[PDB]
Structure formats: structure tokens, C-alpha cells
Design a protein around this ligand. Structure first.
Ligand SMILES: NC(=O)c1ccc[n+]([C@@H]2O[C@H](COP(=O)([O-])OP(=O)(O)OC[C@H]3O[C@@H](n4cnc5c(N)ncnc54)[C@H](OP(=O)(O)O)[C@@H]3O)[C@@H](O)[C@H]2O)c1
Ligand code: SF4
Ligand code: SF4
Ligand SMILES: [Zn+2]
Lengths: 385, 123, 208, 176, 114, 111, 306, 71
């Protein structure tokens, strides 16, 4: 049998993920991919840093999420430190935490529609995506990778503006999602390109430990978005999509309705924000203000020491996970009792979502296999967990 | 079950390259950076290996170096498992001893005497 | 006490004190310590003789579904006289409850793996072999994932230093990309950060 | 809650099949839809002519390093080493010394612009507000041997401009 | 030792296993030398095979040798197939590395006793 | 209905007696275990609790209430595996006492 | 003064200067000099792109590039004013359409026998050839021995190295064979009389320099390069077609980089196994390389497997 | 020794120096006891610090402030 390794080929998509194919003439029936192109030494590296200093290495763990990562870290630290965050701060973590889902669910369709080979829905949506990075630069520090969420809540307040901008932005977005509905849904060939492909629906679709979509849209109703709270996140109203059967085209149609939920939540979140503060007030965790660290005596000693070493975290293990826009996000943060943490093991999606490519692939073509991968939305560097 | 009780001193090898027989470890107590007087940084045995050369990197003057280990300190619990870790991987070492001070006898009131010498002034 | 302090609750602290109690009652063969976390988490310390059946007991029931294997991790702890610590984390689907399984072991002593019990441990179980050398029993395919082909280190333990020994370079001496002993441009200056004076009253050690 | 999408049984009668028969046979689909949504070509191309035109920014945008000083030159840096201890890449290296006047200053001052991961914490750690991430992306030399910035780049680079820097701090220091 | 072994019991299921895969390496050394398109002599490969087995012969304890068996067998998984693209097999030979002195007068002129 | 909600199963076929065999299928195997472990004390408790509400009342939809599983065909799977659970309770012996107590200081966290 | 391991990023004391260093010989020598670590100062003639493949041998700050002609003086003086040792290997084959080609082996080694020597250098080493004799053969082979004596007046102690014919990867002499895909493969010249010379292997060439660069005491005592065992035969030309189974030129092509039906064809068929009283290679040890093992590498033709 | 790395590289060097530029300042005077130094402006520059000026009429540039302060 021919043993071609169609992978390292820089054939668009993402020139990585080099695997083997022991194809039985035309059908595959055996797929054993290799990973480890970026191992980077991540989990060993954090063992020498402090809590505030290690924080951007959670940010660079995806390619896409900037505020959904570091959402799974501060909320994994504030439980250890007996802190609730202040109420103005929680309305921003839901706002940017429900704006990164309008970055994955744009990239999760276009990049899938580029491996397939369509050109024009790649350029028709990233030109609208530019209207959104101006937000990131205006609020935090940079284009994408922002050390913005801290353990002491939000870093700083978003400036004057950004409320007649987001309302200006979000009132003209549903026309753009009505474009791709005409581009892909009512079309037949793309429907014929993906129906009854990847029919994985049994209880081994959950014994493989999958997280969301490539879940509930295939069947079993469950999510971490209204059975487990984060912040002020249950006080808004929305629904969660479910597809019919257990193929890719009934996990594709989650993502059209999923983007039709984030517009509602943003248009529901803006009406409910109170004026208030930014940081936690007790200042053993938050740094004091700049106009304060130049006047009093108490401000500097709880400033100058708070950057030489970090916080004082109590011992005892902990664990949590939140909704990453492609899955769960496990962090088993072992604390020791000093400024420097102990072991920090992460669970990212793709461990389950790509080990189950063995079950999902066989009985099918070779041209099916590239169409499988862009449905799970697998990003490397994120499989470094 | 297949218990097969047997006895051997566990010396494991093959995982490093050559630095088993080359180096010698050191087990000691860190004892009170004496710019201040906090005694929390006692109670834990530590280790540190041999120190080798630090030259000048002739473009900046940085402390570039060989000596690939040079920074490995672990946190031990006591003297008992201090030895048992150095033998389980099996390279040479040398052990210090814990120093605890005098208790000691200090009492105010004897600083004002009728005939003694213990007498303070100029306070 | 005030705002900006996490409001704890007692309802989940009650049932998780209730549920896990009669778990040790109905298998006093493998369970050696159960503890309740002060924020609604549970540990069931298990000697690894019962690595398969206790999972197999939590694999199925009518009062405990627990069929969502989320997290297999591995934590090393030197100065314990049995180093390593395999820790699971599993999820009840129907009940919204988290519970972890802490099973210690040592290096050379193997562990009966969870291959028939769960099929999400296909790539997780191999990872501990590549990173520590903990040889699980009866796995159908043990291989090398997430490391390079020539390492001999199992790096995620503590004796492996920060850099390796294997700083790689190219020469045009013939064609090859050859290995070499490691050479840095900078020390990685190691600080000293542990302040004294014991900020924590509750976790105070036995003073001996 | 729920929603059951793509869950709809067909019509299956006499007349509505003629809507599904004219679709496949004469292609009233795929041209009314996909030949009109492409054209849609008459819109204006939103392209920036980069060597002439430039895009928007923010007043808190990061970039090139620089050092400031007081009115008539004083070296605002006080060498309090705090930017060093929070640099995640340890791109800072400072050796200080008592200068003969008496006040302490610097001797070596380094930013590994290769290693520099741009966490910007140096800008938010100096008490006397010395180092500033200057907003100019002018870069791209030709050697690795050049981007290691010594001190006499940075004071010069902090003095190619100041009115660019001094207006952005003065419009943003009230927030932080 | 209150610990169960891996494969062997005591030294005799062990020492027949290290002899076993030696033949699998021995027919492999002429097999790969024309496959990976590298150019040395084939007897050097057979010398380096027995170089590796003989060096670790100072073991008087089971399940460590058995631990090296799992290490020794996993080497063949990449080896019989093509998973080491012309570099990892060349990594066995410290070829372009400068020679260590290993002599006392020779160490003394160069180095702060490395 | 023709789809059972949870995709991957089929309504196959009859409620109210496919269950009623399988509860009683367990209870006969339940008597085989020597009674010193409390495994019998709770498992026979909930099956008699279940089968009393199972046998035998209309409708299918009413049997969903007061029996907290998924749909009724999936409630088979709630006890399908439980039959496979209790028969292996004879094979290994959890009613035996504790074995291999840890060496007296291991589950102490701060090193 | 030296420091630590000389694996990479060391100092090792020495500061050399290698001219030419764009051909087959001068590149491969420096690729050892950036391994032990030193200030290698290589000035190139007129080629910014043709040194691009050279740079990833010296780590960082170890190499440096300058421009020089050679008929100018200070460009050969400004660079060499801070060094310790200096070798030279400059020269080539056939006369240029613009140059003079005689004094290039006379005044150009003299142009760096200028104030260069006076500046304070030591262990200056030039290259020779084993066959460069004062006899009336050839136009290129002789007029190389003229530089061996008329420039030997300057630098009274040098240890000028004398190599034999070399074989490596991309030389001219061994690649003169098997680049002869033609309507006839003729040897030189249909006779097995004098073939062959001593093909020393290229690792032995670069190893002889680095032992001599702090030997010590190797100045004036000139050295010769032993070849393989032992003379060689006519079989070499048959050895080519048996196992082979029968850089700044221009934008399209160079008009004249020929096979040169001139005194090129005789400069190799003039063997001259010269005097064995030179020490010259085994004493500058250790160099011992056969031919039969390194022949698989350089030859590359259409079969590639069998 | 190091003088070869910049040949044809012109040695881009600083021009002004703050080694001595304090000394050209009109050294301030008050005739009081203790003075604030929020120099460079409020909420920027060096923090507030109080100096005794009784003894060879000076303060000592406060370290932080840098400007020569006296009476
Ligand atoms: N050991 C042997 O068997 C053997 C065989 C044949 C020849 N040689 C001679 O020994 C040395 C080996 O050279 P090679 O094998 O590496 O080939 P090569 O290409 O001739 O290398 C020698 C360098 O000298 C340069 N050069 C020629 N004329 C020059 C001039 N007027 N000014 C400055 N540079 C000039 C050449 O090109 P650039 O100008 O671009 O730098 C070349 O880079 C040469 O001198 C050669 O004549 C030796
Ligand atoms: S920015 Fe602050 S820490 Fe850095 S050199 Fe200046 S004064 Fe020192
Ligand atoms: S700019 Fe970034 S990398 Fe550089 S010192 Fe500041 S925080 Fe560290
Ligand atoms: Zn002042």
C-alpha cells in the first residue's frame, strides 16, 4: 500500500501536521498523524516565572483568542485568592469575552473554505475584520497579543468612545453574515461537498472526551455557558444551537447561529453597564494608581515590592475550565505558596479533537481528509498542552 | 501478584551524558541573609552544584557561559530524604549540618544594678 | 465580611461532603484518603491496585454517570520517597460535578492503564511515558509524541536543567546539521525572591 | 435552551416539487444567488497606498524604545532596576555606579530588541517614568549584530523626537 | 522489593531479550546504509551496534535492563520505517565534534579544570 | 416521534417491559453476591425504588418524570451498563478491607 | 588569551585574516575557524552576494567583511593592522582579458609582503604547489616557482605550505573528469604513463593549517603535503566511468570559462613526486585519508542507487 | 584591540552629555526650612521629597530632582 505523507506540503491551509496514510488503494482505513512541530518548552518554562510575569504566555497559546485566553487564567487564580472582581470589571470581560467568538467563528469558516478552495469568502470577510482590531489597539496595547486581563481584574478603563463605536459596528454586521448564507447554505455543491462526512454520533463521541461543537450540534445538549457561571453572564438571554445529525454539515450550522447569538449579547450587554472602578481595592493584588504612587508613603512600598516579587498565594490544588470558542480549557494550576507557581498543566482542545480523527476518517476518500480537519478548527501551537 | 521481593541499591543512569562522575553536589541550610531578621527561609534543605568558569562575551561583556547545569535548586523536606535523593540517581555529594542558636537567657530588670556590672546607661 | 471577597456557599459544600462519604463506605479496599476542598472539590486518594475498577465503578452507575474524561496530567514531587503523582480529572455529565483521582506511584513500578475503561486516554497516557518514563501497562501502542527523536532525558522532571545539552547548529563541512554541546549567550540570571516572615497563619507547619 | 436547525421535512406534493425540479434542471439557483453576490464588484476598493497613505493608530500604541529626560538635560532614569526585574525576556541589563557628582546613574544599558517580547511592563514599572515605548515602527536593519541597542542609541533615539512622545503621555496619563 | 516487574522475572527472560533484537539490528545495518543514502562503510555500523550494548553491562538488577528493552525496541520503530530524515542516524556519530583531550598534561594548558 | 433526540440511538422498541425485564434481570444476579458490603444495600435500594415507579403505568412521557434519566430509550443505557457493572463485582473483591496503606507521610501537601 | 570550551562563542586568542576565500579551498578552511571561535577578518574583492553562504559558520561578531582590490596598498593594509597571524591563498587559473596574470603571483604576494609584515604580524603562511618548478613547463605551472623564490626574499621565515593536488567536493581537477560527457572519453593523452599525482583529501588540508596556526616554531620550516597510497595509476580514469556508470559568472552565461585547449591540459600531467625530506604533513599531524572511501560522495550521476 | 569592528562604520556616538549639565542651572533659593520638589510638573517626574537646607546653603539636588537646590 502506498504510504504518502501529504502534510509537510505547504499546500495553503497551514503547512504543518505531517502524518502518514496507509491507504488501501483509494480508501484510507489507517491514519496515524505526527505532532510536535511546535513543542516550544512551555510547561517547563513557567516554573521559573512569577504570576504577573508569566501571564502573556497564556495569551500566545492560541492564534486567535486574546481575551478568552487570560480569561481562563485570572479566573483560575482569583478563586485561590478569595477575591470577587469589582462589578464594572465583569461587564468588560463578558464584552471582550463575547467579541473573540466573533474572531474564531469568522476564521473557522473562511480558512475551512480555503482548504476547500474557495477564494472570495476569504477576502470578503477579513476586510470587515479590520474594523475590529482598531478596538484592540485602542484599549490595550497592540495589534493582537495583549496582556490586558490581570488577576486584579481589568488593567485600565477603556477611553472615551468605544460605545458609539461598538453600537456602530454591531448594527451593520448581520448583513455581512447574510452574505455567506447566500454563499454557502443555499448552494448545492458545497452541500454536496459536505454531507454525511464524519458521522460520529455514538457514546464514543463522548468517551473520546470531546468538548463543544463536535458535540451538542451532534446531539447531546450540554454546554458550559449556562450550567456554570463565570461573571455577570447568566443575566443575559440567548439560546444555544443544536444541529440534526452527527456530521460536519450539522456541526457547521452551529457556527452560523452562534454568530447570531453574539450580536444579541453585545446588544444586551451595553444597556446594563454601571459606572464604577476598575481594579480590586485592597491593593495587595492590584497596583495602586499612578497619581498615588508619587505622593504617599504607603503607595510605594505596596508598589515597589509588588513588582520585585508577586503576590502571596495560599497552597492547595485547584482546577477550572471555561468556554474557549472551540472547546473547554482545562488549567490544573498547582500552587505552592510563594511568588513563583509550581506545575501549571494545561488541557487544550485538539488532544481529544484530533486523536478521534482515527475513528472519523476511515471508510472514506483521501480528498475527504483535508475537508475533515477544517471542521474541528484545529490550531497548532495550541496542541502544545 | 508476581511480587518477587529482591534487593538492589537503585542507581539509575543513561539519562544524563557524562556528568555523573564529574561533579559533586552539596546539601546545606540557607541561613539568614543578615540585612534583616526574618527566619522563614530556614526549615528547607536545598542543593547547588559545582561552579565553573564565567568568561566575557566579547561583544557586550555579557556573562555567557558553558557549565550547562549551574542553576538547579530543589526544595527538600529534611535530612532523611536528603541523602536518599543523591544516592537514588547516584553522584557524589557532601553534607553540611543545621545550626540552631542558643535559646537564650535574656531578662530585662537586671540592667539596673546595685553592685553588678550589667548596667546600661545613656538610653 | 465585605464586598470584593468571594461569597462562598454551603449547599455544594454539603452535598459534596455527603456524596463522597459513602464512596469509601462501599469500596474500603482501595480508598485510603478522601478530602473535601473548601471550594467544592473532592479528592479520592487511591493506592494504584484499584486503578482500573474504581474508574470502572465510576464508569457506570445509576447515581453517578461520570463518563467525561477531561484531564490526565502528571505532577512530580521530589522528597516524597515515591516521587511522581498521576492525577485524573473526570466529569459527571448529568450532575455538573467535578472530582479528581489522585494515585501515587513510583518510577519503575508500572501502572495498569485505563485503555479498555476509557478511549480518550489514547494520546494522554503516552505523554507521561515520553516526559517521565512512567511505563503504563498493556497499552496497544507506546511511542514518542511531543518530543524530538534523539532525546534521552524525559525532561519534565526536576533534574533536567532548563536548557538541554543539545544546542543545534549547521556547518557546511559536508551537508549535515550536527549536534553540539550547549552554549548560551547569557546566563539566564536566576533571582532570589522568597521574602521571609510567613504571610500565612492557617497552613502553619507542625513546629517539630 | 434549544434550537433545531436544519431540521425540516420536505413538502412532497404536486406543485412544490416543480420548485425543486426547476432548481436542478434549469439552474434558477446558483446564478440568481451566486452570480449576483459576486457582482457586487462596483464597490470602492479599500486599499491603503502604504508609502504614501497610512492607517489609523491609538495613543497607547507600543513600539520602539526610547529614554526621556527632564528640562534641560538630566537623565530622568535613576537606575532603580525595576524595569529589569519585570522584563519577561530579561532583555534589560544594567550596571550602575556612583558618578563623581554623587547621584547614581548608569554605565551599561541594554535592550535585547531580538529577545524583547513587548510586554511593555517597563513603561508601567518605572516610578520616575523613565523608559517609554515610543510609537514609531521604523525598523529592519540588515544584521543581527546591530539590533542590540546600547545606551548611546537610546538617548539619541529618545532625542530624535520628544514632542511625538510628550503629547501621547500627556493625553493618556489620567487613565493610568 | 515490593514492586512488580515489567516483562522479565530474574535475569534469564532478561539476557535472552538483549541477544534477541541484536540480530534485528544486525540485518538492519546493511539494510539502511543503502536506504538513507549516506556513505560510510557498513562494518563501522556493526561496530557501533555492539558498542552500545557492551557499555551498559554493569547492571546486576532486573527491570532496569527491561526498561532499556522498551527503549531498545522503540528505536527500531523509526528505524525500519523512514522517520529519521538523514540526520538522526548521523547523530549517533560524534563526527564534526572536536576531540576531548582526556589527558592530564593536555587538560592543564587549556581550561579551568572542566 | 421517529428521532430519539440524542442521535446514535433508535427507539427499539417497547417501553415498560424491556425495562421491567432488565431491572429484574439485575435483582436475580444481585442475590448472588455475599451480603457484607453495602453495595447491595444501596443498589437494591434504588432499583426497587425505580422498578416500583416503572411497573407499570402510562404513558411513556409520564415515566420520564420521577425517573431522572434522558429519554426512555436512554434510561435503558442507564441500567444497561449497570448489569455489566454488578456482574464484575463478583470477580474482584471490594468488600475485602484496605490494602497497601501509604508510608505514613505522603498526603501532606506543603512539601 | 583563551577562555572555556571552544565549542562556540569562545575567544581562543587568535585573530586571523584570510584573503581570497570564495573558492573551493578558502571557504572550507574558514569553516573551521568560526567553530573554535576567533576574530576572523575576511575581506572580499567585488562580491556582496557571493559570501552569503559563508556567514552561518561564525556565530556572532566573529566575522567581518571589507573591500579591497590588491593593486591598491592601503586596502591591503587598513584591514591587517590589527591582527596576529595572516595566511594567503589567493590566485586562480587562466589569464584575464584585463589583467596581467604574471605579477599576480609575484607582486600580489609582495603587496602583502609590504608594511603588512612590518606592522608586527607573525606566522605568515603562503601556499605553494608540489609541481611548481623553475623548469620550462609550464606558462602557469612555472611562474609559480618564481614567486616561491623572488618573494621568499621578504618574510625570511614563513613556513609556506606546499600542497599536492587536492580532491574534495567542488574542485576543478577531479570535476574535470566526469564533466566530459562527449562523443569520446580520452585520457591525457591516451597513455597511462605518468598518472597520477598525489590527491590529498580536503579535510587534511584544513587540518594542517589549524595545527600550524599555533604550532609553535613553524616559521621558515616549509612543509609538503603527502597524498594517498601511494603514487596512483591509470585506473583512476577507468574508476570514474565505472562507479559513475558512464558564483558570479554573469546573468545568462560567461563567454569564456572554458576547458582551455592551452597549457591547462599539461599542468596536471607533469606529476613530479618531489623531495621526501620535507617533514611536512605527517609531522604536522595527523592526516591519513584513502581515496576509495571518499569517492562515493563527490561523484554524482544518473543512477544514484545501484 | 577592539578597534577593527567599525572600519567603514563611522561609530555612531552620542553628542550631548548629562555627566555635567546640572552645573549650568540657576541654583534655586528660598530662605525657608523645608521645600517640596515635584519638579518637572505635578504627577510626573520625580516624587515628592522634603529637604533640609541649613548647612553650606544647599540641598544636594535631592538625588531625584537633579536640579541644584539651595538658599
Ligand atoms: N591546492 C591545489 O590543488 C590547487 C589547485 C589549483 C589551484 N590552486 C591555487 O591555490 C589556491 C586555491 O584556490 P581555490 O581552489 O579555492 O579556487 P579559486 O576560485 O581560485 O579561489 C582562490 C580565490 O582567489 C580569488 N582571486 C583570483 N584572482 C584574484 C585577484 N586578482 N584578486 C583577488 N582575488 C582573486 C578568486 O576569486 P575572487 O576574486 O572573487 O575572490 C578566489 O576566490 C589558488 O590560489 C589556486 O590558484 C591550488
Ligand atoms: S526605567 Fe526605572 S528601572 Fe529602568 S533604568 Fe529607568 S529608573 Fe531604572
Ligand atoms: S519592552 Fe517588554 S520585553 Fe522589553 S523590558 Fe519592557 S516588558 Fe520586558
Ligand atoms: Zn525636585
Amino acid at each position: 500500500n502506498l504510504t504518502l505523507n501529504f502534510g509537510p506540503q505547504h499546500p495553503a491551509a497551514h503547512g504543518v501536521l505531517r502524518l502518514v496514510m496507509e491507504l488501501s488503494g483509494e480508501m484510507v482505513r489507517k491514519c496515524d498523524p505526527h505532532i510536535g512541530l511546535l513543542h516550544r518548552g512551555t510547561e517547563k518554562l513557567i516554573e521559573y516565572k512569577t504570576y504577573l510575569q508569566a501571564l502573556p504566555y497564556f495569551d500566545r497559546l492560541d492564534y486567535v483568542s486574546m481575551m478568552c485566553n487570560e480569561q481562563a487564567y485570572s479566573l483560575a487564580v482569583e478563586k485561590l485568592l478569595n477575591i470577587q472582581p469589582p462589578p464594572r470589571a465583569q461587564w468588560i470581560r463578558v464584552l471582550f469575552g463575547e467579541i473573540t467568538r466573533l474572531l474564531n467563528h469568522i476564521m473557522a469558516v473562511t480558512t475551512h473554505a480555503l482548504d476547500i478552495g474557495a477564494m472570495t469568502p476569504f477576502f470578503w470577510m477579513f476586510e470587515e475584520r479590520e474594523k475590529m482590531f482598531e478596538f484592540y489597539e485602542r484599549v490595550s496595547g497592540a495589534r493582537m497579543h495583549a496582556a490586558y486581563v490581570r488577576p486584579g481584574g481589568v488593567h485600565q478603563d477603556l477611553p472615551l468612545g468605544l460605545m458609539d463605536d461598538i453600537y456602530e459596528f454591531s448594527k451593520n454586521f448581520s448583513l455581512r453574515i447574510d452574505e455567506l448564507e447566500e454563499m454557502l447554505t443555499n448552494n448545492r455543491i458545497w452541500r454536496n461537498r459536505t454531507v454525511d462526512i464524519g458521522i460520529v454520533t455514538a457514546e464514543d463521541a463522548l468517551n473520546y472526551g470531546f468538548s463543544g461543537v463536535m458535540l451538542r450540534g451532534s446531539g447531546i445538549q450540554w454546554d458550559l455557558r449556562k450550567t456554570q457561571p463565570y461573571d455577570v453572564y447568566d443575566q443575559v438571554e440567548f439560546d444555544v444551537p443544536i444541529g440534526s445529525r452527527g456530521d460536519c454539515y450539522d456541526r457547521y450550522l452551529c457556527r452560523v447561529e452562534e454568530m447570531r447569538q453574539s450580536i444579541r449579547i453585545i446588544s444586551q450587554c451595553l444597556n446594563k453597564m454601571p459606572p464604577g472602578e476598575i481594579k480590586v481595592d485592597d491593593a495587595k493584588v492590584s497596583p495602586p494608581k499612578r497619581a498615588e504612587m508619587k505622593t504617599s508613603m504607603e503607595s510605594l512600598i505596596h508598589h515597589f515590592k509588588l513588582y520585585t516579587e508577586g503576590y502571596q498565594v495560599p497552597p492547595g490544588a485547584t482546577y477550572t475550565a471555561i468556554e474557549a470558542p472551540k472547546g473547554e480549557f482545562g488549567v490544573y494550576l498547582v500552587s505552592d505558596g510563594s511568588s513563583r507557581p509550581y506545575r501549571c498543566k494545561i488541557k487544550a482542545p485538539g488532544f481529544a479533537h484530533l486523536a478521534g480523527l482515527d475513528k472519523m476518517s476511515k471508510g472514506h476518500m483521501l480528498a475527504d481528509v483535508v475537508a475533515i480537519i477544517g471542521t474541528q478548527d484545529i490550531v497548532f501551537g495550541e496542541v502544545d498542552r | 501478584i508476581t511480587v518477587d521481593e529482591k534487593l538492589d541499591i537503585t542507581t539509575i543512569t543513561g539519562v544524563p551524558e557524562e556528568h555523573i562522575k564529574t561533579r559533586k553536589a552539596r546539601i546545606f541550610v540557607p541561613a539568614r541573609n543578615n540585612m534583616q531578621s526574618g527566619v522563614n527561609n530556614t526549615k528547607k534543605w536545598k542543593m547547588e552544584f559545582d561552579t565553573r568558569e564565567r568568561w566575557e562575551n566579547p561583544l557586550m561583556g555579557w556573562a555567557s557561559t558553558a557549565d550547562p547545569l549551574s542553576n538547579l535548586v530543589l526544595t527538600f523536606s529534611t535530612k532523611e530524604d536528603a541523602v536518599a535523593f543523591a544516592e537514588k540517581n547516584g553522584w557524589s555529594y557532601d553534607v553540611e549540618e543545621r545550626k540552631v542558636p542558643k535559646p537564650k537567657s535574656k531578662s530585662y530588670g537586671a540592667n539596673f544594678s546595685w553592685n553588678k556590672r550589667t548596667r546600661v546607661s545613656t538610653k | 465580611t465585605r464586598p470584593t471577597v468571594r461569597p462562598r456557599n454551603d449547599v455544594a459544600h454539603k452535598q459534596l461532603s455527603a456524596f463522597g462519604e459513602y464512596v469509601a463506605e462501599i469500596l474500603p479496599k482501595y480508598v485510603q484518603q478522601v478530602q473535601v476542598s473548601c471550594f467544592n472539590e473532592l479528592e479520592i486518594c487511591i493506592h494504584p491496585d484499584g486503578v482500573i475498577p474504581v474508574l470502572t465503578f465510576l464508569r457506570d452507575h445509576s447515581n453517578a454517570q461520570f463518563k467525561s474524561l477531561a484531564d490526565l496530567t502528571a505532577v512530580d514531587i521530589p522528597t516524597r520517597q515515591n516521587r511522581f503523582e498521576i492525577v485524573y480529572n473526570l466529569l459527571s455529565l448529568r450532575f455538573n460535578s467535578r472530582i479528581r483521582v489522585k494515585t501515587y506511584t513510583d518510577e519503575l513500578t508500572p501502572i495498569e492503564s485505563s485503555v479498555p475503561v476509557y478511549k480518550a486516554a489514547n494520546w494522554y497516557e503516552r505523554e507521561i511515558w515520553d516526559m517521565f518514563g512512567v511505563f503504563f501497562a498493556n497499552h496497544p501502542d507506546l511511542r514518542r509524541i511531543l518530543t524530538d527523536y534523539g532525546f534521552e532525558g524525559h525532561p519534565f522532571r526536576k533534574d533536567f536543567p532548563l536548557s538541554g545539552y543539545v544546542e543545534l547548529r549547521y556547518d557546511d563541512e559536508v551537508k549535515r546539521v550536527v549536534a553540539e554541546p550547549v552554549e548560551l549567550a547569557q546566563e539566564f540570571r536566576k533571582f532570589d525572591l522568597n521574602s521571609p516572615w510567613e504571610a500565612f497563619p492557617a497552613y502553619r507547619q507542625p513546629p517539630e | 435552551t434549544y434550537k433545531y436547525v436544519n431540521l425540516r421535512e420536505p413538502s412532497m406534493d404536486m406543485k412544490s416539487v416543480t420548485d425543486r425540479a426547476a432548481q436542478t434542471l434549469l439552474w434558477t439557483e446558483l446564478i440568481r444567488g451566486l452570480g449576483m453576490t459576486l457582482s457586487y464588484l462596483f464597490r470602492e476598493p479599500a486599499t491603503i497606498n502604504y508609502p504614501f497613505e497610512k492607517g489609523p493608530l491609538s495613543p497607547r500604541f507600543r513600539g520602539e524604545h526610547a529614554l526621556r529626560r527632564y528640562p534641560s538635560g538630566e537623565e530622568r532614569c535613576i537606575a532603580c532596576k525595576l524595569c529589569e526585574a519585570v522584563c519577561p525576556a530579561q532583555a534589560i541589563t544594567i550596571e550602575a555606579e556612583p558618578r563623581a557628582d554623587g547621584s547614581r546613574r548608569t554605565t551599561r544599558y541594554d535592550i535585547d530588541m531580538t529577545k524583547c517580547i513587548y510586554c511593555g511592563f517597563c513603561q508601567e514599572a518605572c516610578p520616575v517614568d523613565a523608559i517609554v515605548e515610543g510609537p514609531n515602527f521604523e525598523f529592519s536593519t540588515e544584521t543581527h549584530e546591530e539590533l542590540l541597542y546600547n545606551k548611546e542609541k537610546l538617548l539619541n533615539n529618545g532625542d530624535k523626537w520628544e514632542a511625538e512622545i510628550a503629547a501621547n503621555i500627556q493625553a493618556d496619563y489620567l487613565y493610568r | 522489593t515490593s514492586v512488580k516487574p515489567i516483562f522479565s522475572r530474574d535475569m534469564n527472560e532478561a539476557k535472552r531479550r538483549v541477544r534477541e533484537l541484536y540480530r534485528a539490528w544486525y540485518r538492519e545495518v546493511p539494510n539502511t546504509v543503502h536506504l538513507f543514502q549516506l556513505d560510510i562503510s557498513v562494518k563501522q555500523g556493526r561496530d557501533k551496534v555492539r558498542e552500545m550494548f557492551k557499555k551498559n553491562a554493569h547492571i546486576t538488577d532486573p527491570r532496569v535492563v527491561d526498561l532499556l528493552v522498551i527503549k531498545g525496541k522503540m528505536e527500531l520503530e523509526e528505524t525500519i520505517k523512514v522517520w529519521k530524515q538523514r540526520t538522526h542516524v548521523m547523530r549517533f556519530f560524534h563526527e564534526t565534534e572536536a576531540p576531548r583531550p582526556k589527558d592530564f598534561l593536555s587538560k592543564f594548558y587549556v581550561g579551568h579544570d572542566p | 416521534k421517529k428521532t430519539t433526540g440524542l442521535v446514535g440511538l433508535a427507539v427499539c422498541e417497547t417501553p415498560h417491559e424491556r425495562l421491567k425485564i432488565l431491572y429484574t434481570k439485575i435483582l436475580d444476579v444481585l442475590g448472588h453476591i455475599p451480603k457484607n458490603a453495602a453495595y447491595r444495600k444501596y443498589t437494591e435500594q434504588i432499583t426497587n425504588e425505580k422498578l416500583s415507579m416503572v411497573k407499570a403505568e402510562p404513558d411513556v412521557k409520564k415515566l420520564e418524570e420521577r425517573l431522572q434519566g434522558g429519554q426512555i430509550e436512554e434510561v435503558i443505557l442507564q441500567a444497561e451498563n449497570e448489569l455489566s457493572l454488578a456482574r464484575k463485582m463478583i470477580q474482584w473483591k471490594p468488600w475485602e478491607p484496605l490494602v497497601e496503606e501509604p508510608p505514613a507521610s505522603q498526603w501532606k501537601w506543603p512539601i | 588569551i583563551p577562555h572555556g570550551k571552544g565549542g562556540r562563542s569562545s575567544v581562543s586568542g587568535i585573530v586571523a585574516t584570510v584573503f581570497g576565500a570564495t573558492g573551493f579551498l578558502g571557504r572550507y578552511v574558514v569553516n573551521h575557524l568560526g567553530r573554535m571561535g576567533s576574530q576572523v577578518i575576511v575581506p572580499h574583492r567585488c562580491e556582496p552576494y557571493d559570501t552569503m553562504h559563508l556567514r552561518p559558520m561564525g556565530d556572532l561578531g566573529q566575522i567581518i567583511f571589507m573591500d579591497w582590490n590588491g593593486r591598491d596598498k592601503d586596502s591591503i593594509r587598513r584591514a591587517v593592522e590589527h591582527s596576529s597571524v595572516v595566511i594567503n591563498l589567493v590566485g586562480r587559473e587562466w589569464e584575464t582579458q584585463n589583467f596581467d596574470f604574471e605579477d599576480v603571483f609575484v607582486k600580489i604576494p609582495q603587496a602583502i609582503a609590504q608594511v603588512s609584515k612590518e606592522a608586527g604580524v607573525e606566522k605568515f603562511i603562503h601556499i605553494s604547489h608540489l609541481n611548481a618548478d623553475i623548469k620550462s613547463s609550464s606558462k602557469y605551472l612555472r611562474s609559480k616557482a618564481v614567486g616561491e623564490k623572488e618573494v621568499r626574499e621578504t618574510f625570511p621565515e614563513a613556513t609556506i605550505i606546499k600542497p599536492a593536488e587536492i580532491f574534495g567536493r567542488e574542485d576543478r581537477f577531479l570535476n574535470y573528469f566526469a564533466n566530459i560527457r562527449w562523443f569520446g572519453g580520452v585520457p591525457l593523452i591516451s597513455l597511462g604513463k605518468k598518472t597520477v599525482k598525489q590527491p590529498v583529501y580536503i579535510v587534511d588540508v584544513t587540518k594542517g593549517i589549524i595545527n600550524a596556526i599555533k604550532d609553535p616554531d613553524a616559521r621558515g620550516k616549509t612543509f609538503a603535503f603527502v597524498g594517498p597510497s601511494r603514487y596512483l595509476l591509470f585506473d583512476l580514469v577507468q574508476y570514474v566511468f565505472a562507479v559513475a556508470h558512464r558564483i558570479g559568472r554573469l546573468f545568462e552565461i560567461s563567454p569564456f570559462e572554458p576547458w582551455t585547449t592551452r597549457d591547462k591540459v599539461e599542468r596536471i600531467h607533469t606529476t613530479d613526486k618531489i623531495l621526501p625530506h620535507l617533514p611536512g604533513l605527517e609531522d604536522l599531524g595527523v592526516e591519513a585519508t584513502p581515496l576509495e572511501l571518499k569517492a562515493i560522495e563527490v561523484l554524482r550521476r544518473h543512477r544514484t542507487y545501484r | 584591540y577592539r578597534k577593527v569592528r567599525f572600519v567603514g562604520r563611522q561609530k555612531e556616538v552620542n553628542e550631548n552629555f548629562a555627566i555635567d549639565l546640572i552645573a549650568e542651572q540657576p541654583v534655586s533659593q528660598v530662605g525657608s526650612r523645608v521645600i517640596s520638589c515635584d519638579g518637572g510638573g505635578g504627577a510626573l517626574g520625580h516624587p515628592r521629597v522634603y529637604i533640609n537646607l541649613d548647612k553650606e546653603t544647599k540641598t544636594g539636588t535631592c538625588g531625584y530632582c537633579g536640579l541644584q537646590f539651595r538658599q
